[PDB]
């Protein structure tokens, strides 16, 4: 079980004896290691003393020690009250103790290729700001270096750091690590597509990679994990009708009885009752689907119980780790096999205690949601891929299956590069540590082999696999390597390209003899599924092999012309705003032999820098829906606001917000009332969307109102009463942006106001409280209807303009305009009315006169129901009169008499201008 083939490298450079490896994480509780045994004490840090002395010569104070292997374990971001289990048995169990064996099924460790090296475990977590988490991290790596690690494995715990802007103490640490030839290695990420695992990016928005690691943290290598076409797995033997044994892969939760002969009974999907017809003593065989695992396992235990065998309902699916439901032993198996047992004559099986490396149902596979990413300048983010168990966990959370068993992929590559760099210390004695680190990185990427997606008959995108799957055997034997034209990077980025472009790479031959090679370039784009990217590769073509010879101790450039014009029409119909044209320039000794070297390249057929950064306003949605917001069918322009209880996860789209303030609160303020919190009325101040209005006869909903031209009726009355006084920008950003600023322009076109600027905008790549919500409200963009250093603007129509710039180099500034009406005209309403006691009808002396059309004209009254205030509203009759009830009924059956003094006439216009008048006032003499 050696996928990356490190054997030859170890034979050549060793296994890390006398070396030190640093591992920085949020925690190491899940040791994975059997609390990692020990070794063969033959080099450095052989005792507390050994540590202390060095640790003191280097000016280090907080150093610890845990035994051999783990020669260090200081805890940064310490203060915060920690209580693992029993605290190592209460003070290390009276000093000297602590251990936990077992490492079954796990093929790789926290060293991969350097198992005989000591570890420096530095725990670092976010406690009191990223800025301080960053400084700890920087110190955490400077100490590793001063402690002599040469190899550092970094993980940022529970992410949420995507696009974070940390202090320069961080980048400073990285530069220093680079200067000393120390490698910093991190993981590429398993949830890297815009929208998250529960969604797919839209085909017209190709900028969908989400980089989890902050730019400042430029690690030596970012590595993606993948599942090889074969893996070390537990198994279960079965006898087929033809009378023969068939050993199959299985993932089990809870342990079965080693070597038995369990009987098994099919139960469909366990969604019905007759499904577990028996199961009496039979293991429940169930197909995945319709309902969740927890239930399948529970229903199985109800009946016969014993154990269960759930089989995937997807062909090339990853093995799923079942939940532990009442110690119930549950194992997961591929679909193929599942369908095999469902027909096997002898419904009997045996669980082998011998893990065996067998083919995988998935075959060579990278999760469709993993690694996707581009750097600010156009380079693909991931550098290389490495093997991992890659199992989908059904218990990471209750929202989606989280990819698991990938944490050991980056460390594997780290170990391999440490050994290769070591190999170079003897192979190229004159090189400095930095130079050896650079060479090792270039060779590792060049020699890495491009993974193939059999399922799509295409290579996995370099945006996912980087330069390819690490191959230690090739790296160690490598006497040549390929870089881009600049001779600095091991990846090529072309930025914007037309249908015809050239890819030029440089082959560096370090051997004393010329080398003959064959080269080709593969060309591919993205696969689309309707209006969404499928997150799968789409091969276009590959060039036919060309021969070239590189003279001894020299380098030669290779240029491969590419022409994908014949695919333009079809591809544009699927991805109208452009698409990627990417691939690999591959080299071989002979076209029939295996890939010797490969370097990835990527171009964008369009103008990537200028792709739209903001999702259009929901007002513009012909459907009423948006990427993160579902519309209400059977409700044209319904667009409720925050309501009485806001849900951060709802209404996440581009729009303008404003506030609704009921006349009751407005009046309470104009009077005195300090409290207002317990006023005898049921309405509250609410945040709503501009352009939306409640119905005359409220129905608890707000609706978008539009002008004859289709634009939303946005209007404010900046008169300080809090009712629709301002508009504020809320946006769903599809791409990162900078310098977001709002400005207001009058009819002429003059800028009368400019907001403060929001330096950085982070795209809304998900809609989750733990990472980022689907939209963001920008308070600095709020416009209260006033001009630059001045007063309220004059009534009229204005242009509320939101400006923002994509971060891509040279990107043009983008903007979205909203027409906003300003109007502070108080409504003119009747000064008198008459009331018919026989008719209970109030007749106003005249209709309301407002500058903006009438929004609502009602008669309000409030009555108590069990100390619970309730404000009722009366709409006008067809002739403009209002009928006033003589009473209101309580839910308990009590009659509440109503008098003229209980009623208040309220008129509100579209801009929120409002006037309220006691009906007694209208009736009195004049």
> DSSP 3-state assignment of 337?
helix
Q: How far apart are CA 371 and CA 208, in angstroms?
A: 11
Contacted by 721, from Ca ion, its own copies, none: CB < 5 to 8 Å by type: Ca ion
Nearest residue to 760 (alpha-carbon basis) of 209, 165, 131:
165
Query: Any bridge partners for residue 742, and if so which?
Result: 802
Nearest residue to 349 (alpha-carbon basis) of 247, 233, 232, 243:
247
Here's the x/- map for Ca ion, 703-742, by CB under 5 A: it reads as --------------x-x-x-x-x-----------------
Give the up-direction half-sphere exposure of residue 780: CA atoms within 13 A in the CB hemisphere: 14
Contacted by 725, from Ca ion, its own copies, none: CB < 5 to 8 Å by type: Ca ion
> DSSP 3-state assignment of 873?
strand
Residue with tokens 């996912």: 464
Examine the residue annotation and report whether 438 is marked as an active-site residue of this protein.
no
Q: How far apart are CA 369 and CA 766, in angstroms?
A: 13
* Pure H helices in 230-310: 293-302
Contacted by 31, from its own copies, Ca ion, none: CB < 5 to 8 Å by type: its own copies
Classify each residue of 566-603 as buried b or exposed e, where b means 16 or more C-beta atoms within 10 Å of its C-beta.
ebeeebeebbebbbbbbbbbbbbeeeeeebbbbbbbbb
Q: How far apart are CA 84 and CA 904, in angstroms?
A: 64
* Pure H helices in 466-512: 472-477
DSSP one-letter code for 294: H
Contacted by 302, from its own copies, Ca ion, none: CB < 5 to 8 Å by type: none
CB-nearer residue toward Ca ion: 317 or 912: 912
Contacted by 770, from Ca ion, its own copies, none: CB < 5 to 8 Å by type: its own copies
Q: How far apart are CA 124 and CA 146, in angstroms?
A: 18
Catalytic-role residue among 4, 25, 74, 490: 25
CB-nearer residue toward its own copies: 424 or 905: 905
Contacted by 148, from Ca ion, its own copies, none: CB < 5 to 8 Å by type: none
Counts for the chain of helices (H) and strands (E), in that order: 14, 49
Q: How far is the CB of 149 from its own copies (least distance, A)?
A: 21
Classify each residue of 422-445 as buried b or exposed e, where b means 16 or more C-beta atoms within 10 Å of its C-beta.
bbbeeeeeebebeebbbbbbbbbb
CB-nearer residue toward its own copies: 128 or 589: 128
Q: How far apart are CA 255 and CA 783, in angstroms?
A: 64
- The alpha-carbon radius of gyration of the chain (Å, integer) is 34
Examine the residue annotation and report whether 245 is marked as an active-site residue of this protein.
no
Contact positions with Ca ion (CB under 5 A) in 9-38: none
Contacted by 717, from Ca ion, its own copies, none: CB < 5 to 8 Å by type: Ca ion
Q: How far is the CB of 775 from its own copies (least distance, A)?
A: 8
Contacted by 723, from Ca ion, its own copies, none: CB < 5 to 8 Å by type: Ca ion
Catalytic-role residue among 47, 88, 175, 290: 88
User: Are the C-beta atoms of residues 463 and 602 closer than 8 Å to each other?
Assistant: yes
- Measure Cα distances from 559 to 128, 549, 562, 732 in Å: 52, 13, 10, 41
3-state secondary structure 580-603: EEEEEEEEECCCCCCEEEEEEEEE
Q: How far is the CB of 156 from its own copies (least distance, A)?
A: 11
> What share of residues in the chain are helix, strand, coil (percent, to 5)?
15, 35, 50
Examine the residue annotation and report whether 563 is marked as an active-site residue of this protein.
no
Q: How far apart are CA 434 and CA 420, in angstroms?
A: 13
Query: Any bridge partners for residue 289, and if so which?
Result: 291
User: Are the C-beta atoms of residues 613 and 606 closer than 8 Å to each other?
Assistant: no
**E-strand stretches of 388-514:** 391-393, 402-404, 452-453, 458-459, 480-484, 492-497, 500-509
> DSSP 3-state assignment of 295?
helix
Contacted by 215, from Ca ion, its own copies, none: CB < 5 to 8 Å by type: none
Q: How far is the CB of 226 from its own copies (least distance, A)?
A: 22
CB-nearer residue toward Ca ion: 193 or 852: 852
> DSSP 3-state assignment of 404?
strand
Query: Any bridge partners for residue 758, and if so which?
Result: 740
Q: How far apart are CA 580 and CA 209, in angstroms?
A: 12
Q: How far is the CB of 875 from its own copies (least distance, A)?
A: 6
Q: How far is the CB of 130 from its own copies (least distance, A)?
A: 8
Contacted by 719, from Ca ion, its own copies, none: CB < 5 to 8 Å by type: Ca ion
Classify each residue of 773-782 as buried b or exposed e, where b means 16 or more C-beta atoms within 10 Å of its C-beta.
bbbbebeebb
Q: How far is the CB of 663 from Ca ion (least distance, A)?
A: 11
CB-nearer residue toward its own copies: 397 or 487: 397
Q: How far is the CB of 707 from its own copies (least distance, A)?
A: 18
DSSP one-letter code for 721: S
CB-nearer residue toward Ca ion: 507 or 665: 665
Q: How far is the CB of 845 from Ca ion (least distance, A)?
A: 26
CB-nearer residue toward its own copies: 148 or 885: 885
Contacted by 30, from its own copies, Ca ion, none: CB < 5 to 8 Å by type: its own copies
CB-nearer residue toward its own copies: 175 or 886: 886
Vertex 500 angle, CA 497 and 506, to 5° = 80
Contacted by 650, from Ca ion, its own copies, none: CB < 5 to 8 Å by type: none
CB-nearer residue toward its own copies: 57 or 838: 838
CB atoms within 10 A of CB 759: 11
Tokens read off for 33: 């290691």
CB-nearer residue toward its own copies: 577 or 682: 682
Catalytic-role residue among 192, 334, 370, 407: 407
Contact positions with Ca ion (CB under 5 A) in 901-920: 912
CB-nearer residue toward Ca ion: 155 or 852: 852
Q: How far is the CB of 776 from its own copies (least distance, A)?
A: 4
User: Are the C-beta atoms of residues 26 and 145 closer than 8 Å to each other?
Assistant: no
Q: How far is the CB of 678 from its own copies (least distance, A)?
A: 8
Tokens read off for 543: 């060039």
CB-nearer residue toward Ca ion: 380 or 911: 911
**E-strand stretches of 261-390:** 264-266, 283-287, 308-311, 320-321, 330-333, 350-359, 384-387
Q: How far is the CB of 718 from Ca ion (least distance, A)?
A: 6
> Per CB under 5 A, does 661 bind Ca ion?
no
User: Are the C-beta atoms of residues 729 and 656 closer than 8 Å to each other?
Assistant: yes
Q: How far is the CB of 411 from its own copies (least distance, A)?
A: 14
Contacted by 867, from Ca ion, its own copies, none: CB < 5 to 8 Å by type: none
CB-nearer residue toward its own copies: 398 or 426: 398
- Which stretches of the chain bind Ca ion, using CB under 5 A? 717, 719, 721, 723, 725, 912
Active site members? 25, 88, 407
């Amino acid at each position: 079980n050696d996928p990356s083939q490190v054997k030859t490298l170890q034979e050549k450079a060793g296994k890390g004896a006398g070396t030190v490896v640093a591992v920085i994480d949020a925690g190491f509780d899940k040791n994975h290691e059997a609390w990692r045994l020990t070794d063969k004490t033959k080099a450095r840090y052989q005792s507390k003393e050994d540590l202390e002395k060095a640790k003191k010569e280097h000016g280090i104070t907080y150093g610890e020690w845990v035994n051999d292997k783990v020669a260090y374990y200081h805890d940064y971001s310490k203060d915060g009250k920690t209580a693992v289990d029993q605290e190592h048995g209460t003070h290390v169990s009276g000093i000297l103790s602590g251990n936990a064996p077992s490492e079954t099924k796990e093929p790789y460790r926290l060293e991969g290729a350097m198992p005989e090296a000591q570890l420096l475990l530095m725990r670092v977590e976010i406690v009191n700001g990223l800025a301080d988490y960053a400084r700890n991290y920087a110190q955490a790596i400077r100490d590793a270096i001063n402690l002599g690690a040469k190899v550092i494995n970094m993980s940022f715990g529970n992410a949420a750091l995507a696009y974070a802007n940390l202090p320069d103490e961080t980048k400073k640490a990285f530069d220093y690590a680079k200067s000393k030839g120390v490698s910093i290695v991190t993981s590429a990420g398993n949830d890297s597509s815009f929208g998250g695992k529960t969604r797919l990016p839209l085909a017209d928005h190709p900028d969908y990679g989400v980089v989890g690691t902050p730019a400042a943290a430029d690690s030596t290598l970012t590595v993606a994990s993948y599942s090889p076409d074969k893996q070390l797995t537990e198994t279960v033997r079965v006898k087929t009708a033809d009378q023969q044994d068939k050993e199959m892969p299985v993932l089990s939760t809870n342990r079965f009885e080693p070597n038995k002969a369990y009987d098994y009974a099919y139960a469909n999907r366990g969604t019905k009752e007759d499904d577990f017809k028996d199961v009496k003593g039979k293991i429940a065989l169930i197909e995945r689907g319709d309902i969740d695992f927890k239930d399948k396992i529970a229903k199985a235990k109800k009946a016969g119980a014993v154990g269960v065998l759930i089989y995937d309902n997807q062909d090339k699916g990853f093995p799923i780790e079942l939940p532990n439901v009442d110690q119930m032993p549950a194992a997961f198996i591929s679909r193929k096999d599942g369908l095999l047992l469902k027909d096997n004559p002898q419904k009997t099986i045996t669980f082998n205690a011998t893990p065996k490396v067998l083919p995988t149902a998935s075959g060579t596979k990278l999760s469709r949601f993993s690694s996707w990413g581009l750097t600010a300048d156009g380079n693909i983010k991931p550098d290389i891929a490495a093997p991992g168990q890659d199992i989908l966990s059904s218990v990471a959370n209750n929202k989606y299956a989280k990819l698991s068993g990938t944490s050991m992929s980056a460390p594997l590559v780290a170990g391999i590069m440490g050994l290769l760099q070591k190999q170079y210390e003897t192979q190229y004695p004159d090189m400095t540590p930095s130079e050896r680190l650079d060479l090792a990185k270039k060779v590792l990427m060049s020699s890495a082999t491009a993974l193939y997606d059999e399922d799509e008959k295409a290579y996995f995108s370099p945006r996912q696999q980087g330069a390819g799957a690490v191959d230690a055997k090739k790296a160690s034997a490598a006497t040549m390597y390929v870089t881009d034209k600049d001779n600095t990077s091991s990846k090529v980025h072309l930025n914007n390209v037309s249908d015809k472009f050239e890819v030029t790479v440089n082959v560096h031959n370090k051997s004393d003899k010329p080398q003959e090679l064959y080269y080709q370039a593969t060309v591919q784009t993205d696969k689309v599924d309707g209006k969404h990217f499928a997150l799968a590769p789409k091969v276009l073509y590959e060039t036919s092999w060309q021969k070239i010879t590189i003279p001894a101790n020299s380098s030669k450039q290779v240029t491969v012309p590419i022409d994908a014009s014949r695919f333009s029409k079809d591809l544009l119909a699927q991805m109208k705003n452009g698409y990627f044209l990417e691939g690999f320039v591959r080299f071989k000794q002979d076209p029939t032999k295996e890939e010797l070297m490969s370097i990835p390249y990527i171009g964008f057929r369009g103008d990537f820098g200028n792709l739209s950064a903001l999702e259009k306003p929901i007002y513009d949605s012909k459907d009423g829906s948006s990427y993160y917001h579902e519309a209400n069918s059977d409700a044209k322009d319904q667009l409720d606001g925050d309501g009485l209880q806001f849900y951060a996860l709802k209404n996440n789209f581009t729009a303008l917000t404003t506030e609704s303030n009921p006349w009751t609160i407005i009046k309470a303020v104009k009077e005195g009332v300090e409290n207002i919190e317990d006023i005898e009325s049921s309405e509250i101040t609410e945040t709503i969307f501009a352009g939306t209005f409640a119905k005359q006869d409220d129905d608890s909903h707000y609706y978008i109102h539009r002008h004859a031209n289709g634009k939303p009726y946005a209007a404010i009355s900046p008169n300080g009463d809090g009712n629709r006084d301002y508009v504020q920008f809320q946006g769903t950003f599809l791409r990162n942006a900078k310098n977001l600023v709002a400005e207001v322009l009058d009819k002429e076109g003059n800028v009368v106001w400019t907001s403060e600027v929001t330096e950085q905008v982070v795209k809304n790549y998900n809609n989750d409280l733990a990472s980022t919500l689907g939209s963001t409200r920008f308070e600095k963009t709020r416009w209260d209807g006033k001009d630059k250093d001045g007063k309220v603007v004059a009534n009229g129509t204005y242009t509320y303009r939101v400006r923002y710039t994509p971060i891509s180099s040279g990107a043009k500034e983008q903007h979205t305009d909203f027409d906003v009406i300003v109007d502070n005209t108080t409504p003119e309403v009747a000064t008198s009315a008459t009331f018919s006691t026989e008719d209970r009808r109030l007749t106003l002396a005249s209709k309301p006169k407002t500058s903006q059309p009438v929004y609502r004209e009602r008669i309000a009254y409030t009555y108590m129901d069990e100390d619970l205030p309730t404000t009722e509203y009366i709409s006008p009759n067809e002739d403009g009169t209002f009928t006033l009830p003589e009473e209101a009924e309580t839910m308990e059956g009590a009659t509440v008499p109503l008098k003229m003094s209980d009623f208040t006439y309220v008129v509100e216009d579209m801009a929120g201008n409002i006037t309220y008048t006691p009906v007694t006032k209208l009736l009195e003499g004049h």
